[PDB]
Structures are given as structure tokens and as C-alpha cells.
Curated annotation (Swiss-Prot), chain A:
Quaternary state and interactors: Subunit of dynactin, a multiprotein complex part of a tripartite complex with dynein and a adapter, such as BICDL1, BICD2 or HOOK3. The dynactin complex is built around ACTR1A/ACTB filament and consists of an actin-related filament composed of a shoulder domain, a pointed end and a barbed end. Its length is defined by its flexible shoulder domain. The soulder is composed of 2 DCTN1 subunits, 4 DCTN2 and 2 DCTN3. The 4 DCNT2 (via N-terminus) bind the ACTR1A filament and act as molecular rulers to determine the length. The pointed end is important for binding dynein-dynactin cargo adapters.
Subcellular location(s) per record: Cytoplasm, Cytoskeleton
Organism encoding this protein: Homo sapiens
Annotated GO biological process: retrograde axonal transport of mitochondrion
Record key words, sorted: Cytoplasm, Cytoskeleton
Protein name, UniProt field: Actin-related protein 10
Gene Ontology CC terms, in alphabetical order: axon cytoplasm; azurophil granule lumen; cytosol; dynactin complex; extracellular region; ficolin-1-rich granule lumen
Highest taxon of source: Eukaryota
UniProtKB/Swiss-Prot annotation, chain B:
Taxonomic lineage from the root: Eukaryota, Metazoa, Chordata, Craniata, Vertebrata
UniProt keyword annotation of Ubl conjugation present: yes
Cross-link type Glycyl lysine isopeptide (Lys-Gly) (interchain with G-Cter in SUMO2), residue numbers: K163
Main subcellular location: cytoplasm
Source species of the chain: Homo sapiens (Human)
Gene: DCTN4
Database matches in InterPro entries: DCTN4
Residues modified to Phosphothreonine: T322
Residue numbers bearing the N-acetylalanine modification: A2
Record-given protein name: Dynactin subunit 4
UniProt cross-references to Pfam families, sorted A to Z: Dynactin_p62
Protein localization: Cytoplasm, Cytoskeleton; Cytoplasm, Cytoskeleton, Microtubule organizing center, Centrosome; Cytoplasm, Cytoskeleton, Stress fiber; Cytoplasm, Cell cortex
Coiled coil: 140-158
Keywords noted in UniProt: Acetylation, Coiled coil, Cytoplasm, Cytoskeleton, Isopeptide bond, Phosphoprotein, Ubl conjugation
Consequence the record notes for mutating C228S: Loss of ATP7B-binding
One cellular component term from this protein's GO annotations in UniProt: focal adhesion
Curated annotation (Swiss-Prot), chain C:
Job of this protein: Part of the dynactin complex that activates the molecular motor dynein for ultra-processive transport along microtubules.
Tissue specificity comment: Ubiquitous.
Organism this protein belongs to: Homo sapiens
Compartments in which it is found: Cytoplasm, Cytoskeleton; Chromosome, Centromere, Kinetochore
Assembly: Subunit of dynactin, a multiprotein complex part of a tripartite complex with dynein and a adapter, such as BICDL1, BICD2 or HOOK3. The dynactin complex is built around ACTR1A/ACTB filament and consists of an actin-related filament composed of a shoulder domain, a pointed end and a barbed end. Its length is defined by its flexible shoulder domain. The soulder is composed of 2 DCTN1 subunits, 4 DCTN2 and 2 DCTN3. The 4 DCNT2 (via N-terminus) bind the ACTR1A filament and act as molecular rulers to determine the length. The pointed end is important for binding dynein-dynactin cargo adapters.
The name this protein goes by in its record: Dynactin subunit 6
GO molecular function, one term: dynein complex binding
Gene Ontology biological process terms, A to Z: mitotic spindle organization
Lineage of source species: Eukaryota, Metazoa, Chordata, Craniata, Vertebrata
Keyword entries, A-Z: Centromere, Chromosome, Cytoplasm, Cytoskeleton, Kinetochore, Phosphoprotein
Family that this chain belongs to: Belongs to the dynactin subunits 5/6 family. Dynactin subunit 6 subfamily.
Gene designation: DCTN6
Curated annotation (Swiss-Prot), chain D:
Record-given protein name: Dynactin subunit 5
PANTHER family attached to this UniProt entry: DYNACTIN SUBUNIT 5 (PTHR46126:SF1)
Description of how the protein assembles with itself and partners: Subunit of dynactin, a multiprotein complex part of a tripartite complex with dynein and a adapter, such as BICDL1, BICD2 or HOOK3. The dynactin complex is built around ACTR1A/ACTB filament and consists of an actin-related filament composed of a shoulder domain, a pointed end and a barbed end. Its length is defined by its flexible shoulder domain. The soulder is composed of 2 DCTN1 subunits, 4 DCTN2 and 2 DCTN3. The 4 DCNT2 (via N-terminus) bind the ACTR1A filament and act as molecular rulers to determine the length. The pointed end is important for binding dynein-dynactin cargo adapters.
Source organism: Homo sapiens (Human)
Main location: cytoplasm
A GO CC term assigned to this protein in UniProt: nucleoplasm
Family: Belongs to the dynactin subunits 5/6 family. Dynactin subunit 5 subfamily.
Sites bearing N-acetylmethionine, chain numbering: M1
Biological process terms in GO annotation: aorta development; coronary vasculature development; ventricular septum development
Length: 387, 361, 156, 182
């Protein structure tokens, strides 16, 4: 039998490929590219007239299949959820576009946090999955994932662009093609995201905490108490337009301090795991502390994890979680496959799943008969097995 | 030529599962059922795979095994252009890859010269491949036991255990090296986000680790009518051939309408638009036009066989158009009835939409 | 001023104070306009058809063995040695090209930048790639130019 | 598309025995080596370099103004090889094009301000879009579209392009009439 397909889903939109582990991971960032449109158009929007979407998936799907991957779509169907929280559109719509445009011969749909543990051989919690927005923490038990201890933040990195557009604009020399120093704004009213990104992609990094905090002291120059150290060296970014964007070495340092500010807001990038452990059964915390899993492209941001853990550990001493939990370590389990890759692999794994797959799958027929696909959030999930 | 001849102003409606309006030059005519068909309404099949650079043909089974990639050709990670193999004589031929466009060479990343022109360039294997293979075998054994349990439960209502060691967690994550805090960053030495994503198995940070990837193969597509399952377009299997086995393009069966001159169009003002109707066949073809408001001549026009004015197999006709909108583009629709000789007399009625352009004030 | 061994075509349009270095060849329809100051062309330079070199006021020293392909437009104040400007490339007024630079076809160098040695500028986005391998010393392309330039054009 | 009569000043173009319409401003270098097959039109300031290698132009070819047709040279360590430049039938080359191809096939349309790399081979019914830069030794397969800087494969052309190309090239020459004084 032929296995299997893997879908774009967020930072993940770039994750087009097909099973097994050998597939290309074709990079689609994914947009249309419709001629009459300003390009590109991101067609990946919630709260969208579905029609608009309809026509978009139709066309994307058509496209991806059409070209991009050899697919011969009638034989392989997988939809990964990288969402649990996807609203019913568009899922309804996704199916809806199948289904009839695309005749779909049963489909199994599955979440990332389960596809996550598949690789470590671990059937237990914690999974933190961070990438395009809205970040999710979800202890997975052996077996049930447990939603009741459900947590979510931005960003992950979508907001880094405001933080960066802004800051780029708060620094400010562009050395324009006329050798003039000019304002960014106004030579440009905006910085396209691709710039922002590029700059980010290669320039942002996460500092060690003892000094991550002096970076914070720059904001807070209290009564002169600043102990924000000299920045690294400045960078001439060449900018397109035959412009040069000079960048302070100091921004590399600040952008990443969003992730980590403590306002009167909780420092949540850092909890999540902590606000959930307090929520979790005591009888399982023993596994959850200690056994942590981090997937998602944004943890490719270097030094992230350093702090991260330091922070967390740091925080474990805040009484509030301390008295509440007592302490212990944390150990990271990590695959060797890259952070982005674990969803993708656990999609490959799934071809193994063929004896099961067509069983735990939602039938085409059913759907043809009702068209109802269960949601965990519905009062009528039909027992599909009636069929 | 379709964009040079403004074929986009004259659209023909295809009646199928989806209503599609497109230029006649982009449409196919099915001689077996005598119906017009769009590219969207027909079925697309994979005929063959080929490399656009070495022009090697790949069978569909071979393309599946090789993940639809060319084994000898690579994409330059510098500009995405295909690399060429070059030889130098050493006091023996030594081969290296180079791009003619951006001047990138395999030496830029420290790759040693090869004794063979092709086949010596290999991609790094995934270090964790064996780990995935053991995990897959483990879950397959569990899936077999779980399947049997489900079959027993359904019937009632009507093997050395693979031990896998869990991944060892790391107690301490590698800290950021001190070099990143004070070292000047060279933006030319580090790979861009797009260049990193081209190698998703390990995503190199440094340009020296940015290995060339195998070139993607292209596909020759065949088109078939869904209603009668007959082929409308079939190229030959060999990618180097310009010949087609079947070419049933609509422009050879249905009279082709073109706009020659458009008058100054004004709101509610009758204006005469000059169209040309061309008979695509060697036989005499009879065409009658039926009804912005458009008024067409009520008389049947006879077009000469393919060997305002009459010249051979084309006649220039004026139609009267009265724009009904105060602003926007002036569009008119009419039905074109003509006789068809089915060599595979039928009267066919084609819905034709004309885009005349913006209304003048 | 034509140096001994330089080939200047009768169809070449030269205006102003222009010095042509030895073994330089100027193809038909080339336009060299020295309005703001003298243009100094070094030895072994090749200027092909439709090449436009203008030294204009803000309303020029060209090194040795440089190649100007068809339809190139160069306003540079200073060029180094062994540079190649591909067809329809534009080099702006304040561009400083050092030695061993390659500018790809249809690239627009409007930036106030000193291009470092061994830089290849290619693509619509004018991406600068520092060549990490010594570009093969153009001694091989200079040997062909020195033997081919005197043989394919009617030396005056 | 009412292909209007491309009325030219009758004094500016010389009509040859083979029906070629060549502007007086055209630059023909090595004319003994330049073979223009019948019904060819060569516009103003076109440069054809036949001094060192033969240039062969097919039937119904149209070369627009300031186009430079130059055969590619291959430098070997023991000498320079002169390659003839072969252009097929019904080839239409837009304005400001630089052609260094070894061979251009029949029914080929080269877009405006395009740069073709040395020793490129363009097959029959090829389309190159405006402002496209083809790297040296690029081979364009039949019914393929390349565009951009660098010029990359964007997609294939429908087979119907050949039928359209036949009528346009023949009509273009028929519409290219001497300016009959009104
Ligand atoms: Zn091969
Ligand atoms: Zn390249
Ligand atoms: Zn039918």
C-alpha cells in the first residue's frame, strides 16, 4: 500500500513532503500567487469567508498536487493537525474541498503533540510546541493527552516582526544610494517582512540570563543603574534597493527579550511548563518534571535554550511554584531530527500505521453520508463505527 | 502569441461540473461527444518524468524510487541554476561542479575534485535513520497486536517483544559560545533562510556546509475528457520530441471570434464593434448569432472553407453594443449557433463573452 | 589619444578627453563621453557594442584588462583591475569597484558601497556572494584576450 | 488584434530578390557569411556579426531594432573554435536583445531586452519572457517557458502556440508594407 502525506501547517508552512522519512520537505512557503492579486496572498486566514477560502484551497491543493509533489492523490490522504484548537472551518472547508473537488477516497487526522512523542519512544509528557502563532504547551500522558492542563502564548515569532520593525525604525541610519543618512521612515514607510525576517533569521540570539538581565537593565536605566554591557559590533546590512541598513550590534541582543520580559503579566514564555505542572496530577508530575520535549521551529533561535532552561529553573525557586511543587530537575529529551521535523516525522511513521490507518480514520463514505466528522468539541460526535 | 493577439478578450463557456470561461486557444474540443472542454474540466495524468537539463527520460516507477529527482544534475544553492561538470588536467581528468551564472563551484565549500564526471557527488545520510527504523518496527508490532484485539471484539459482538530504549534526555544544554557576544558578524558567511530550508535534514548555518541538492524532475502531462474517457491531448513519451499523438484543440473545430476595432463606448450610446469570424475547417460553415446590451445581425452568415468585409474563410461583422453601467468594463454575451460535421450534421450553440474594456465618460 | 596596439573602430563614438590604453579594443556603436573630466582606459580593455561609458557632472579611472559587454552602462568614478560587467548591467555614479569583481547582467549597482575584492553580484536582487575559493586567476582569460584582441579587429 | 499595416518609409528598406526587407541603418559585418533566407525583415541599428562565423537566418524571421546577433566563440587551450549561429524558421526577436546562442529553433519568440548566454541552444516553439537572462550553455526544450534573472523554468506552452506563431509571422511580413503616401 502507498503511504502518506504531509501538510504545511504554520512555521510549518514550509512542510510539504510525503512519507516515509525519506521525503523531500519541500519548501513551500505557502502562498498563492494569483495573478490578479497583490502577491503574494497568504492563504493559510481564519474567520475568512469560506468561499474565499474555497476557492483558495482549491487552488492550492490543486497546485501542490499538480506540480509540486508527484502525489496521485487518490491513494494517499493525511491531515495533520497542528493546531486541537482549529476552529471547525476550515476544517470543514478543507474537507469540503475534498470531498467534492477532490474526490477523496478515509482520512485520519492527527495532532502534533502526539505525533511528537512518536520519536523518542516516549509515550509520556511534556510537549512544548512553538512556531507560527500561538505557542502551545501540552502535557501528553501516556496515552490521553490531557487538555485540561492546556496552555497558549503568542508568539511564536510573528510578533517579533513588530518588535523589529519598530526597532529598526528606532535606530536610525540608512545609508541611502545617495550617500545621505536618512530616516527610515521616511524613505520607507515600512520594512517588508521578508526583510525583517531575514535580518532575524540570521541576526537574533538569546543571551545568558545573568546578562540577559543587564540587557533588561537598559530599559531600565534606573537612577543610572545600567549595567547593560557593550554590545556586540555593529553590522552593515546590506539592504535591498541598494540601500544599507546599518544595524546596531545591540539589537540582536534586544529583540530577543521579548520572549522573556516579566511584566505584571507572568513571565510566561517561561512558564507554561510551570503553570501547567501545577495543574497536573501529582501522581504524574514525577514524569513531567524531568521529561520535557520541545518541538517547533522557533527553537532553533540560538541560545534559546540556555536561557530557557536556566529560566525555568530559575523560576522554579520563585516561591510560588516552589512551594507549590517542591523541586526537581528537568532533563530535555530531544531528537536528533530537527525541531521543525518532528511533526513531519511522526507523519512518516504513520505510514506504518496502514493496518490501523484505515481503521482509525474517518470514512469517506461516512462523510459522504453525513458528512459529519467528529470534533472533540461536539455534542454529536456520531459513533462512526456504526458503519 | 495568445497574449500578443489579445485572446483574453474573447472567452467561451464550457458547460460541465464546473462552469469555466476561457480563451478558445486554451480550450479543447472533444470530437467523440462534440463538446467544448476546459483545461480545468478534463483529467490530468502523468505520462513521463524528465530532467530539463540533461534531457534524460525517467519511467514513473524509477521517479517514485528516486523521489522525482535527477541523479546526475544538481541545483546551485547560490542561485538555484543547474550546475555543470568541468574537467581539469592534472600532471588525469579531475571533475568539479560549477555554475555559469553566479560562478559558484564545489571548491567554495571545500569539496574535493572527483575522478568521475557523474555519480561521485553524494548527499549526507541522516545520522538518526537507524533510530527511525527501530521505532517503525516497534509500532508495527504494536499495531498488529491491537488490530487482532479489535477483530476479536467485532467477532464477539457479531514474537519476541521489540524493546526500544527511550531517548536519553540531556541534563544540560550546550551554552551559547562567548564568540557571539563580541565577534563581528559577517553576513556573507552565513546562509540565508531560503538556503537553509533547501537542506531540511540539517539546515546549514555556514555557506561552507551548503551542499548542492539533486535537480527536481519535470513531468509531461496528458489530458483526457472525463465524460467519454477519450484523449484530447497526448504528447510522445520521449521528453526531446516536439510531436503529439493527439491534438484536438478547440480552435480547429469552432469558429474563432476576434475583436478588430472597438469604438469610443459611452453610457447608453449605441456603438458598432467590429468582430471577425474565422472558419477553421476546409468545408463551408454556417453560423448565426443570437442575443451591456448586444444586438447581433439576425441573418445566417456563410463562411468560406479554409483553403464589414469578406476575405477567404474570414468575414468582418459589426454588432451594436449599448453599455448598461455608468462605470467599469463593458462586457457583452451572445450565443453563436453553427453546424458541425462529426467525422468521429450537429448544430452546436456556443456562449461567447466579449470584453471591450473600460467605458468612456 | 589612441595608444600603440589599441583598435578603435570608425563606427565608435568618442567625445571629450579620452585616453585609450595599449591593446584596448572598442567595437562599433560604443559611446565614450568624457564631459566632466578625462576618462583613462588602461591596457587590454575590451569595450563591446552598445557599451555606454559616461563621465557626467552631478547635475574616471578604468584599470587594466576590464571587459564591458554589450549594452553595459558605467558611470563609476573608479574601477579596479580584472573586472567584468555583463550585458545591460548598470554601474552607478558613486560605485567603487575594486579588483576581480563580476557584475551580472541586468544588475543595478546604485549603492554607495566599495565592493570588496572577488565579489560576484548576481540576480535581480544583486546578491553579493564573496567567492570563498580564489576565483581562478583570470591569467587564462587575459592570455586569450591578448592573443584574440589584435586578430579579430582591423587595427588602425 | 487588428494587426495594422506596419507602414515603413520605402526609402529606408532595401528589398532583396529573396524578399528580405533590410533597413539602410542595419550593420552587416562579413556580409558574404550572412545568409538571410526569404521573407526576413531586419530593422534599424541591427548588428549581425558574420566576419568569423556564418550566420544563418531562417524563413519569415523578424529582427527588431538594436538586436545584436553574435555567434558564440569557444576558447580551447590550442585555439579558438568558430561556431556558426543557426536561427530556425518563424523566429521573432524583440528590441534590445543580445543573442549569443549556438542555435535557435523554429517558432521561437525572444522577449524584449533579453540576454542569451554564450552557446545556448533554444529548441522549437520556445518562449523567453522580457528581461530574462539565460546562463551560458542553457538548453531550452521545445514548448518551455523560462523567465527571470536568472531565467528559470516557469512552465510549458500549449501545443496550439505553433499554429498561432505560423499565422502571426506570415501576417506580420504581409502587414509590413511600404508607407503608401495617403
Ligand atoms: Zn543521468
Ligand atoms: Zn549557481
Ligand atoms: Zn456531455
Amino acid at each position: 500500500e502507498k503511504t502518506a502525506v504531509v501538510i504545511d501547517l504554520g512555521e510549518a508552512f514550509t512542510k510539504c513532503g510525503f512519507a516515509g522519512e525519506t521525503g523531500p520537505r519541500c519548501i513551500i512557503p505557502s502562498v498563492i500567487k494569483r495573478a490578479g492579486m497583490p502577491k503574494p496572498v497568504r492563504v493559510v486566514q481564519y474567520n475568512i469567508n469560506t468561499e474565499e477560502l474555497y476557492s483558495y484551497l482549491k487552488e492550492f491543493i490543486h497546485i501542490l498536487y499538480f506540480r509540486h509533489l508527484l502525489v496521485n492523490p487518490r491513494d494517499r490522504r493525511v491531515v495533520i493537525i497542528e493546531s486541537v484548537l482549529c476552529p471547525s472551518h476550515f476544517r470543514e472547508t478543507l474537507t469540503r474541498v475534498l470531498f467534492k473537488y477532490f474526490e477523496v477516497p478515509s482520512v485520519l487526522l492527527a495532532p502534533s503533540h502526539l505525533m511528537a512523542l512518536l520519536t523518542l519512544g516516549i509515550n509520556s509528557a511534556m510537549v512544548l510546541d512553538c512556531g507560527y502563532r500561538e505557542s502551545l504547551v501540552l502535557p501528553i500522558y501516556e496515552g490521553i493527552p490531557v487538555l485540561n492542563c492546556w496552555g497558549a502564548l503568542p508568539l511564536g515569532g510573528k510578533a517579533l516582526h513588530k518588535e523589529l520593525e519598530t526597532q529598526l525604525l528606532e535606530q536610525c541610519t540608512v545609508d541611502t544610494s545617495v550617500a545621505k543618512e536618512q530616516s527610515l521612515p521616511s524613505v520607507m514607510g515600512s520594512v517588508p517582512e521578508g526583510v525583517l525576517e531575514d535580518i532575524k533569521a540570521r541576526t537574533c540570539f538569546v543571551s545568558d540570563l545573568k546578562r540577559g538581565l543587564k540587557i533588561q537593565a537598559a530599559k531600565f536605566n534606573i537612577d543610572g543603574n545600567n549595567e547593560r554591557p557593550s554590545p556586540p559590533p555593529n553590522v552593515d546590512y546590506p539592504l535591498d534597493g541598494e540601500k544599507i541598513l546599518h544595524i546596531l550590534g545591540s539589537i540582536r541582543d534586544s529583540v530577543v527579550e521579548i520572549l522573556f520580559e516579566q511584566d505584571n503579566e507572568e513571565q510566561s514564555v517561561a512558564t507554561l511548563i510551570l503553570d501547567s505542572l501545577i495543574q497536573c496530577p501529582i501522581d504524574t508530575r514525577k514524569q513531567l518534571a524531568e521529561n520535557l520535549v520541545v518541538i517547533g521551529g522557533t527553537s532553533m533561535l540560538p541560545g534559546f535554550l540556555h536561557r530557557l532552561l536556566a529560566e525555568i529553573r530559575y523560576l522554579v525557586e520563585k516561591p510560588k511554584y516552589k512551594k507549590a511543587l517542591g523541586t526537581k530537575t528537568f532533563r530535555i529529551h530531544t531528537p536528533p531530527a530537527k525541531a521543525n521535523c518532528v511533526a513531519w516525522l511522526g507523519g512518516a511513521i504513520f505510514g506504518a500505521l496502514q493496518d490501523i490507518l484505515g481503521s482509525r480514520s474517518v470514512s469517506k463514505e461516512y462523510y459522504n453520508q453525513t458528512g459529519r466528522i467528529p470534533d472533540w468539541c461536539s455534542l454529536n460526535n456520531p459513533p462512526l463505527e456504526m458503519m | 502569441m495568445a497574449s500578443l493577439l489579445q485572446s483574453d478578450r474573447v472567452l467561451y463557456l464550457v458547460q460541465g461540473e464546473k462552469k469555466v470561461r476561457a480563451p478558445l486557444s486554451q480550450l479543447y474540443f472533444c470530437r467523440y461527444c462534440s463538446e467544448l472542454r476546459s483545461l480545468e474540466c478534463v483529467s490530468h495524468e502523468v505520462d513521463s518524468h524528465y530532467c530539463p537539463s540533461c534531457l534524460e527520460n525517467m519511467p514513473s516507477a524509477e521517479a517514485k524510487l528516486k523521489k522525482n529527482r535527477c541523479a546526475n544534475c544538481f541545483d546551485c544553492p547560490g542561485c538555484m541554476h543547474t550546475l555543470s561538470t568541468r574537467a581539469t588536467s592534472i600532471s588525469k581528468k579531475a571533475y568539479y561542479l560549477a555554475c555559469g551564472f553566479c560562478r559558484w563551484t564545489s571548491r567554495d565549500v571545500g569539496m574535493a575534485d572527483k575522478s568521475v564526471a557523474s555519480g561521485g557527488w553524494q548527499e549526507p545520510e541522516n545520522p538518526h535513520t537507524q533510530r527511525m527504523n527501530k521505532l517503525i518496527e516497534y509500532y508495527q508490532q504494536l499495531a498488529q497486536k491491537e488490530k487482532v484485539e479489535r477483530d476479536r471484539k467485532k467477532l464477539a459482538r457479531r514474537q519476541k517483544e521489540i524493546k526500544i530504549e527511550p531517548a536519553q534526555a540531556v541534563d544540560e544544554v550546550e551554552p551559547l559560545p562567548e564568540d557571539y557576544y563580541t565577534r563581528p558578524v559577517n553576513l556573507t558567511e552565513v546562509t540565508t533562510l531560503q538556503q537553509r530550508l533547501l537542506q531540511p535534514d540539517f539546515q546549514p548555518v555556514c555557506a561552507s556546509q551548503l551542499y548542492p541538492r539533486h535537480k527536481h524532475l519535470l513531468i509531461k502531462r496528458s489530458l483526457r475528457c472525463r465524460k467519454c474517457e477519450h484523449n484530447l491531448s497526448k504528447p510522445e513519451f520521449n521528453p526531446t520530441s516536439i510531436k503529439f499523438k493527439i491534438q484536438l484543440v478547440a480552435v480547429n473545430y469552432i469558429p474563432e471570434v476576434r475583436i478588430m476595432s472597438i469604438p469610443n463606448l459611452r453610457y447608453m450610446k449605441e456603438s458598432q464593434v467590429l468582430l471577425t469570424l474565422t472558419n477553421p475547417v476546409e468545408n463551408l460553415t454556417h453560423v448565426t448569432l443570437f442575443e451591456a446590451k448586444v444586438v447581433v445581425p439576425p441573418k445566417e452568415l456563410v463562411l468560406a472553407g479554409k483553403d464589414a468585409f469578406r476575405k477567404a474563410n474570414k468575414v468582418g461583422i459589426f454588432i451594436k453594443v449599448t453599455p448598461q453601467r455608468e462605470e467599469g468594463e463593458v462586457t457583452v454575451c451572445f450565443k453563436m449557433k453553427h453546424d458541425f460535421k462529426n467525422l468521429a450534421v450537429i448544430w452546436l450553440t456556443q456562449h461567447v463573452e466579449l470584453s471591450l474594456g473600460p467605458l468612456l465618460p | 589619444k589612441i595608444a600603440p596596439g589599441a583598435v578603435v573602430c570608425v563606427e565608435s563614438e568618442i567625445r571629450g578627453d579620452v585616453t585609450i590604453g595599449p591593446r584596448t579594443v572598442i567595437h562599433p556603436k560604443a559611446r565614450i563621453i568624457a564631459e566632466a573630466g578625462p576618462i583613462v582606459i588602461g591596457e587590454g580593455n575590451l569595450i563591446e557594442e552598445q557599451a555606454l561609458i559616461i563621465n557626467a557632472y552631478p547635475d574616471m579611472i578604468i584599470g587594466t584588462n576590464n571587459v564591458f559587454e554589450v549594452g553595459c552602462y558605467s558611470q563609476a568614478m573608479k574601477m579596479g583591475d580584472n573586472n567584468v560587467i555583463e550585458s545591460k548591467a548598470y554601474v552607478g555614479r558613486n560605485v567603487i569597484l575594486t579588483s576581480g569583481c563580476i557584475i551580472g547582467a541586468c544588475c543595478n549597482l546604485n549603492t554607495f558601497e566599495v565592493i570588496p575584492e572577488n565579489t560576484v553580484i548576481y540576480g535581480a536582487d544583486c546578491l553579493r556572494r564573496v567567492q570563498t575559493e580564489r576565483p581562478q586567476p583570470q591569467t587564462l582569460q587575459l592570455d586569450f584576450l591578448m592573443k584574440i584582441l589584435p586578430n579579430y579587429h582591423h587595427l588602425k | 488584434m487588428e494587426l495594422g499595416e506596419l507602414l515603413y518609409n520605402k526609402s529606408e528598406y532595401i528589398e532583396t530578390a529573396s524578399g528580405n526587407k533590410v533597413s539602410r541603418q542595419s550593420v552587416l559585418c562579413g556580409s558574404q557569411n550572412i545568409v538571410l533566407n526569404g521573407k526576413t525583415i531586419v530593422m534599424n541599428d541591427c548588428i549581425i556579426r558574420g566576419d568569423l562565423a556564418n550566420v544563418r537566418v531562417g524563413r519569415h524571421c523578424v529582427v527588431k531594432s538594436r538586436s545584436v546577433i553574435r555567434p558564440p566563440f569557444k576558447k580551447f587551450s590550442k585555439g579558438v573554435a568558430f561556431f556558426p549561429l543557426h536561427i530556425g524558421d518563424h523566429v521573432f526577436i524583440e528590441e534590445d536583445c543580445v543573442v549569443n546562442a549556438a542555435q535557435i529553433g523554429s517558432y521561437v519568440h525572444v522577449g524584449k531586452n533579453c540576454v542569451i548566454g554564450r552557446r545556448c541552444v533554444l529548441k522549437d516553439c520556445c518562449k523567453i519572457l522580457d528581461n530574462t537572462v539565460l546562463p551560458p550553455e542553457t538548453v531550452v526544450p521545445p514548448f518551455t517557458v523560462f523567465s527571470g534573472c536568472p531565467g528559470l523554468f516557469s512552465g510549458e506552452l500549449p501545443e496550439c502556440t505553433q499554429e498561432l506563431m505560423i499565422d502571426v509571422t506570415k501576417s506580420y511580413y504581409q502587414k509590413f508594407l511600404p508607407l503608401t503616401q495617403v
